Amino acid sequence: MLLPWLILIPFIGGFLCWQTERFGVKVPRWIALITMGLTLALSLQLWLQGGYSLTQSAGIPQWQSEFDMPWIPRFGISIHLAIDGLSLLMVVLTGLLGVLAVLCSWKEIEKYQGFFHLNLMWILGGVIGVFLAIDMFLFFFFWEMMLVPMYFLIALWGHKASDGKTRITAATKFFIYTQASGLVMLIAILALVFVHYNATGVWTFNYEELLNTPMSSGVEYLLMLGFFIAFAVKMPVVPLHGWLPDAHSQAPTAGSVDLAGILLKTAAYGLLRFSLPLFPNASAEFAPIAMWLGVIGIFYGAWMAFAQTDIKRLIAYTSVSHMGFVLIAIYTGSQLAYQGAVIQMIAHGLSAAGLFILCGQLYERIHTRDMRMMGGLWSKMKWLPALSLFFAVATLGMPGTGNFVGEFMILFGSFQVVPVITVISTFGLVFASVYSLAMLHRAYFGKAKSQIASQELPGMSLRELFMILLLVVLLVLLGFYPQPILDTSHSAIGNIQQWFVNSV
Amino acid sequence: MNMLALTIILPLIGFVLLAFSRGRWSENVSAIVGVGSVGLAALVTAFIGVDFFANGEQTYSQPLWTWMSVGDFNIGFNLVLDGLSLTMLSVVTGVGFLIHMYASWYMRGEEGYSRFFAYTNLFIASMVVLVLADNLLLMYLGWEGVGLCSYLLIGFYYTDPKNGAAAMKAFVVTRVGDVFLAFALFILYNELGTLNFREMVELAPAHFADGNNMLMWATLMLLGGAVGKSAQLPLQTWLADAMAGPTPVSALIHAATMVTAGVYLIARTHGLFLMTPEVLHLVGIVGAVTLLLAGFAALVQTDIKRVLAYSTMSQIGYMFLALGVQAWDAAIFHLMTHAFFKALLFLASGSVILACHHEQNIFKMGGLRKSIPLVYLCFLVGGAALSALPLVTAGFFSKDEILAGAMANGHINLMVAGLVGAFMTSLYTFRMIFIVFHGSLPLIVLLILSTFVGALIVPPLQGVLPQTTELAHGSMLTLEITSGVVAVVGILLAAWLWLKRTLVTSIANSAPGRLLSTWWYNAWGFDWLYDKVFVKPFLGIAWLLKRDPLNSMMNIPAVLSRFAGKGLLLSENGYLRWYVASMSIGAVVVLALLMVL
Ligand SMILES: CCCCCCCCCCCCCCCCCC(=O)OC[C@H](COP(=O)(O)OCCN)OC(=O)CCCCCCCCCCCCCCCCC
Ligand SMILES: CCCCCCCCCCCCCCCCCC(=O)OC[C@H](COP(=O)(O)OCCN)OC(=O)CCCCCCCCCCCCCCCCC
Ligand SMILES: CCCCCCCCCCCCCCCCCC(=O)OC[C@H](COP(=O)(O)OCCN)OC(=O)CCCCCCCCCCCCCCCCC
Ligand SMILES: CCCCCCCCCCCCCCCCCC(=O)OC[C@H](COP(=O)(O)OCCN)OC(=O)CCCCCCCCCCCCCCCCC
Structure with a gap:
């Protein structure tokens, strides 16, 4: 009931941010903060009234909330929203990251700032819509309509030091990757709908009815592969990753775009919600390939992160390695590893948000991303x-932060399932320590390697400092007390796990 | 007595306050906050020990919350205290308090005073969590904390790139050890379903009645973590190269917290190690080999701090040997006494470094007894405890119990390795002492504690650790006699060579002698071996991959599309006759295709 308004509030807020552009240049940032805070507080309200900790796994489907309104009745297509514990954690994360994104672009006083806010809330509403939709066509519709605002702000509002051709190239690469993979997912969706219609005789795009689809082994594999290609472009899974460092490097200078569009992990949610319950046998056969792709992602992202001279590219490749861990976790079939993957998704969102915000601030003070031109910055900032x-x-996964809880719970469950992959992944944690210390030594330690690093730099503003400290406090609380998060997503994870292991 | 959480929280409060102070406070205020938090932890430890002895030495549990609860995966945030935890907590808090006082005197006028004390307070907090945890995951939290704090404190003078390189090396080597420890944790949860130490010991014999392979794997990985943190074989290079940091950092790492963590981990998990006797004898072998290599390296070192580092490695090898021969009480007693005299030796070395006001070589020094006699006396008593001077110092008694435990169990190779290691310790210790010296309330406190007064302290390990098997009184008498004779022979012989230097220069110039001296100066080539097999291939693969080859191979279809479009656009030449010709060609193709089906 309140989920249609969950998607509609960011859209109307961005529309009004564009509409009241005439009343001032510093007007639309307050409207942006108001609508993102409204979405966040509404999500917090539905969390507090959800009662997810007192929910038991009663099979699939099992939603806290659901809503259906017929949109294209010709194909049996309806706006069908639903929410349970995992999707609620994802939308609360989306609201928090959107608030941080609005606070991140606070001082961007430009003529067309209202349109940038409109694009940002179209992105946030699209991410929330992917997290809430349970109609397959409608889910794919949000999955692809997140693209256009993200493309336009990467191409037009992006990194100003680079030429416009570089930003346009990065935006086009990102759009082509994600839209081609989305079209492959649409092909899989259409084939699944037609197979169910041939089996029964009714048109439906409802996820709850497509679950009981009798398919031969091999057709289910192809549908799973189309879904996985979409979810692997957006995950990122190697070798479908390079759009991610080029899009982070050509993202707008403030860092809000990194928070709004990329640092929300809709692909892991899609693999948990759609790839495993719709195609459980195919996912079971696909699990070793996905696990070894995750291992390759961990080590390749670590080696790529060590090799960078740009900080933003280093953080992007760090994200690639962490999502390799998550990809190993999702295909284990283990409840402990699934809960660890949820914690890892949230902790990666918070930690990469903090890293990208700090990198944007550092670029604001020193006007370069090159780590050979900075050094000794501990004595300057x-x-x-x-x-x-x-x-x-x-x-690097230090205990006391939520990343350790996520990574080690993933590794505990994975060692219960796949021991060798777990061993190799823990040596990946050693690699994580190596690249994190390399970035710290190249940026902030040693002597100044240029003229801008030899100068005292201005201190950070109170808004950026307070949002960074909020991220710090949330990460520490996740590391020391992850139990509310685990109790929130226990029922949904349990139902997905039971459907996955009771069908193979 | 429920103030174990206080002993965690107080150094945490000190770290948080001094970190958010950011150097704005005065030096006196920063010293008061840091040293007062560590001293308050020590005082709460003293009261906890008093009440622990008042209640008949009973194990106490203080749960706080449930850290993780996912089905059968239940990890609690609970502290436990027994005699071993009390001994480690008392050693950590007291020696850390003395080092904090000396650092408050020593760091005057330095940059990052409050940052230094915040890092040392987080170090103390992490080690208190390490020794007070009742399960392996909370102990892993403390383990990673002490690793991070050691990285932060070794590279304290961050402007010098050598300091940062040494800190990064120490962090990476310790993190390898922690990955081994993580393997042990995964094995133990997968097998026993719990990580609580008492619960694992209770459930291991029932679960491993048929197959003992996974328990042997878990204990081997526990030893891997232990040698990772205690700087033993094959992860010992970081202690050699961690001399880049300041002197109280070295005292904290070598005496109070860092190197004792592996010994504590082996002692705490002694039930699992006793269920796998081959792994326990492997612990003893690792300690014996490590102390041999450390002594042979310590004789040929050139700086005071390197000699002290390799002496620390040698005595940690002694403790590992004592654990391997089931002399648990001797191992913990030697841990306390070595904390005392090694902290004293590092404090005196810092004093002589301040007196020389430079990182001067030891071969230039000589005749400093007429200028700084108190530092000479501190160095002499610390070396006498180091070299086991009989019936005067506590280190002699601790090494005597270690050797008695080695004798009473029936291990001859470890016994002779310990004897020649005591000989080697005497030679390198008095080599350093007579090369440098010929040719202050904490200082008094650990000078007193480096005598038999420190040997009077008995660790209350009756209920927690098993008692060592009793050697015969005659055999104990001959072992004490031969230990004293070996120590005195080493002292007198090293004084004979290193009082002019004539016989030493014979091997110090011969080609096999130069080869052996340079081989032992390079940590037996372990740094070179690790550079060749780990670091250089890492840099090579990073340089090979720096251009992102997978991104280019996925960019290949864009190149193919551009080439195909450029090729196809050549047919749009603008000639009407070619357009008619292409229409007729397409007509031919369509007609032929329709005819062939
Ligand atoms: C200019 C650039 C563009 C042009 C050049 C590049 C090429 C573009 C085209 C690429 C795709 C080609 C077609 C791929 C699909 C092939 C389908 C097929 O052959 O299916 C056969 C069979 C069908 O199932 P069947 O067994 O008949 O079911 C009835 C009884 N069971 O199928 C099965 O039984 C299952 C077969 C599964 C394996 C085949 C599909 C491989 C997909 C590879 C990509 C994804 C790899 C995994 C993810 C990697 C990391 C993201
Ligand atoms: C380059 C980008 C685009 C990707 C390439 C384009 C799409 C390639 C799809 C290849 C499909 C190969 C199918 C081979 C068999 C076809 C004939 C046949 O025997 O069909 C069997 C079956 C009809 O018999 P029926 O009784 O209806 O069976 C019900 C059980 N499903 O048929 C059915 O029931 C329907 C079978 C549908 C199979 C799924 C089709 C879509 C799968 C997702 C996309 C392709 C795979 C992922 C991408 C590959 C790499 C690019
Ligand atoms: C738990 C018991 C022990 C068990 C093991 C735990 C190990 C893991 C601990 C994880 C926490 C992070 C550890 C590393 C943090 C290092 C921060 C640091 O360097 O602080 C020092 C610095 C002051 O240094 P200085 O040079 O004087 O000032 C800079 C400019 N002049 O400080 C500053 O510049 C300001 C402070 C920077 C951030 C400080 C640390 C923040 C994270 C911890 C507290 C988070 C909030 C806790 C409360 C949450 C709500 C209840
Ligand atoms: C090794 C760390 C040791 C612990 C100290 C520092 C931890 C990190 C501090 C920030 C994060 C705190 C997260 C945990 C808060 C308590 C969570 C909880 O469940 O509390 C409830 C518990 C009483 O409920 P109980 O019945 O035990 O629970 C069973 C199911 N409800 O409540 C209690 O039992 C009361 C617990 C009180 C704890 C007070 C801690 C004060 C810490 C001050 C310094 C903070 C330093 C932060 C930075 C550390 C390094 C990153």
């Missing part, structure tokens, strides 16, 4: 090197 030290410490 007041807050930035120590908070960067905290987020790089959380990045």
Whole structure:
């Protein structure tokens, strides 16, 4: 009932951010903060009234909330929203990251700032719509309509130091990757709908009815592969990753775009919600390939992160390695590893948000991303090197931060399932420590390697400092007390796990 | 007595306050906050020990919350205290308090005073969590904390790139050890379903009645973590190269917290190690080999701090040997006494470094007894405890119990390795002492504690650790006699060579002698071996991959599309006759295709 308004509030807020552009230049940032805070507080309200900790696994489907309104009745297509514990954690994460994105672009006083806010809330509403939709066509519709605002702001609002051709190239690469993979997912969706219509005789795009689809072994594999190609472009899974560092490097300078579009992990949610319950046998046969792709992602992303001279590319490849861990977790079929993957998704969102915000601030003060032109920055800045030290410490998976809870719970469940992959992944944790310390030494330690690094730099503003400290506090609380998050997503994870292991 | 959480929280409060102070407070205020938090932890430890002895030495449990609860995966945030935890907590808090006082005197006028004390307070907090945890995951939290704090404190003078390189090396080597420890944790949860130490010991014999392979794997990985943190074979290079940091950092790492963590981990998990006797004898072998290599390296070192580092490695090898021969009480007693005299030796070395006001070589020094006699006396008593001077110092008694435990169990190779290691310790210790010296309330406190007064302290390990098998009184008498004779022979012989230097220069110039001296100066080539097999291939693969080959191979279809479009656009030449010709060609193709089906 309140989920249609969950998708509609960001859209109307961005529309009004564009509409009241005439009343001022610093007007639409307050409207942006108001609508993102409204979405966040509404999500917190539905969390507090959800009662997910007192919910038992009663099979699939099992939603806290659901809503259906017929949109294209010719194909049996309806706006069908639903919410349970995992999707609620994802939308609360989306609201928090959207609030941080609005707070991140606060000082961007431009003529067309209202349109940038409109694009940002179209992105956030699209991510929320992917997290809430349970109609397959409608889910794919949100999956692909997140693309156009993200393309336009990467191409037009992106990294100003680089030429416009580089930003346009990065935006086009990202759009082509994700839209081609989305079209493959649409092909899989259409084939599944037609197979069910041939089996029964009724048109439906409802996820709850497509679950009981009798398919031969091999057709289910192809449908799973189309879904996985979409979810692997967006995950990112190697070798479908390079759009991610080129899009992060050509993202807008403030860092809001990294938070709004990329650092929300809709592909892991899609694999948990759609790839495993619709095609459980095919996912079971596909599991070793996905696990070895995850291992390759971990080590390749670590080696790529060590090789960078740009900080933003280093953080992007760090994200690639962490999502390799998550990809190993999702295909284990283990409840402990699934819960660890949920914790890892949330902790990766918070920690990479902190890293990208700090990198954007550092670029604001030193006007370069090149790590050979900076050094000894611990003696020049007041807050930035120590908070960067905290987020790089959380990045390598230090206990006391939520990343450790996620990674080690993933590794506990995976060692219960796949021991050798777990051993190789823990040596990947050693690699994570190596690249985090390399970034810390190249940026903030040693002597100044240029003229801008030899100068005292201004301290951070109170808004950026307070949002960074909020991320720090949330990461520490996740590391020391992850139990509310686990109790929130226990029922949905349990139902997905039971459907996955009771069908193979 | 429920103030174990206080002993965790107080150094945490000190770290948080001094970190958010960011150097703005005065030096006196920063010293008060850091040293007062560590001293308050020590005082709460003292009261906890008093009440622990008042209640008949009973194990106490203080749960706080449930850290993780996912089905059968139940990890609690609970502390436990027994005699071993009390001994480690007392050693950590007291020696850390003395080092904090000396660092408060020593770091005057330095940059990052409050940052230094915040890092040391987080170090103390992490080690208190390490020694007080009742399960392996909370102990892993403390393990990673002490690793991170050691990285932060070794590279304290961050402007010098050598300091940062040493800190990064220490962190990476310790993290390898922690990955081995993580393997042990995964094995133990997968097998026993719990990570609580008492519960694992209770459930291991029933679960492993048929197959003992996974328990042997878990204990081997526990030893891997232990040698990772205690700087033993094959992860010992970081202690050699961690001299880049300041002197109280070295005292904290070598005496109070860092190197004792592996010994504590082996002692705490002694039930699992006793269920796998081959792994326990492997612990003893690792300790014996490590102390042999450390002594042979310590004789040929050139700086005071490197000699002290390799002496620390040698005595940690002694403790590992004592654990391997089931002399648990001797191992913990030697841990306390070595904490005392090694902290004292590092404090005196820092004093002589301040007196020389430079990182001067030891071969230039000589005749400093007429200028700084108190530092000479501190170095002499610390070396006498190091070299086991009989009936004067506590280190002699601790090594005597270690050797008695080695004798009473029936291990001859470990016994002779310990004897020649005591000989080697005497030679390198008095080599350093007579090369440098010929040719202060904490200082008094650990000078007193480096005598038999420190030997009077008995660790209360009756209920937690098993008692060592009693050697015969005659055999004990001959072992004490031969230990004293070996120590005195080493002292007198090293004083004979290193009082002019004539016989030493014979092997110090011969080609096999130069080869052996340079081989033992390079940590037996382990740094070179690790550079060749780990670091250089890592840099090579990173340089090979720096251009992102997978991105290019996925960019290949865009190149193919551009080439195909450029090729197809050549047919749009604008000639009407070619357009008619292409229409007729397409007509031919369509007609032929329709005819062939
Ligand atoms: C200019 C650039 C563009 C042009 C050049 C590049 C090429 C573009 C085209 C590429 C795709 C080609 C077609 C791929 C699908 C082939 C389908 C097929 O052959 O299916 C056969 C069979 C069908 O199932 P069947 O067994 O008949 O079921 C009835 C009884 N069971 O199928 C099965 O039984 C299952 C077969 C599964 C394996 C075949 C599909 C491989 C897909 C490879 C990509 C994804 C790999 C995994 C993910 C990697 C990391 C993201
Ligand atoms: C380059 C980008 C685009 C990707 C390539 C384009 C799509 C390639 C799809 C290849 C499909 C190969 C199918 C081979 C068999 C076809 C004839 C046949 O025997 O069909 C069997 C069956 C009809 O018999 P029926 O009684 O209806 O069976 C019900 C059980 N499903 O048939 C059915 O029931 C329907 C079978 C549908 C199979 C799924 C089709 C879509 C799968 C997702 C996309 C392709 C795979 C992922 C991408 C590959 C790499 C690019
Ligand atoms: C738990 C018991 C022990 C068990 C093991 C635990 C190990 C894991 C611990 C994880 C936490 C991160 C550890 C590393 C943090 C390093 C921060 C740092 O360097 O602080 C020092 C720095 C002051 O240094 P200084 O040079 O004087 O000032 C810079 C400018 N002049 O400080 C500053 O510049 C300002 C402070 C920067 C950030 C400090 C740390 C923040 C994270 C911890 C607290 C988070 C909030 C806790 C409360 C949450 C709500 C209840
Ligand atoms: C090794 C770490 C040791 C612990 C100290 C520091 C931990 C990190 C501090 C920030 C995060 C705290 C997260 C945990 C808070 C308590 C969670 C909880 O469940 O509390 C409830 C518990 C009483 O309920 P109980 O019945 O035990 O629970 C069973 C199911 N409800 O409540 C209790 O039992 C009361 C617990 C009180 C704890 C007070 C801690 C004060 C810490 C001050 C310094 C903070 C330093 C933060 C940074 C550390 C390094 C990153």
